[PDB]
Design a protein around this ligand. Structure first.
Ligand SMILES: O=C(O)[C@H]1O[C@H](O)[C@H](O)[C@@H](O)[C@@H]1O
Ligand SMILES: [Ca+2]
Ligand SMILES: [Ca+2]
Length: 125
């Protein structure tokens, strides 16, 4: 049951920020508000199979901000909606099923809409 901080991951069109309370680690990733913004985590698991990946995020708007999840090149979850949390400090979790190989994997979450992604604190699996 391991935490992988977003601010420690590979960030494309985003910024490590810390101005909303409740994040874990040293901060969170604020996705740029464009399609294509992404965070990519390097994770390690002991066995091949499908893992529950718990995404901790916030969305202080009324519009869902969908992400596509992929593992080392291949789609894992398409159009996962990240709906309102009301305020930016009100972190919530959503579980996404991802199939992994034994050992090291990269899990990428890319924003598919012009609003970019929710703010993302971490994933846990
Ligand atoms: O709408 C957005 O994406 C942004 O809105 C605000 O600026 C908020 O403080 C950011 O944390 C958020 O990322
Ligand atoms: Ca943003
Ligand atoms: Ca964090």
């Amino acid at each position: 049951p391991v935490d992988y901080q977003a601010e420690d991951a590979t960030i494309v069109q985003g910024a490590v920020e810390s101005n909303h309370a409740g994040y874990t680690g040293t901060g969170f990733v604020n996705y740029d508000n464009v399609a294509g913004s992404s965070v990519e985590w390097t994770v390690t698991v002991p066995s091949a199979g499908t893992y529950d990946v718990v995404v901790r995020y916030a969305n202080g708007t009324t519009t869902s901000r969908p992400l596509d999840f992929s593992v080392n090149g291949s789609i894992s979850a398409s159009g996962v909606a990240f709906g309102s949390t009301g305020t930016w400090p009100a972190w919530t979790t959503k579980t996404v099923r991802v199939t992994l190989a034994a050992g090291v994997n990269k899990i990428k979450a890319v924003a598919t809409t012009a609003n970019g992604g929710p703010n993302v604190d971490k994933i846990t699996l």
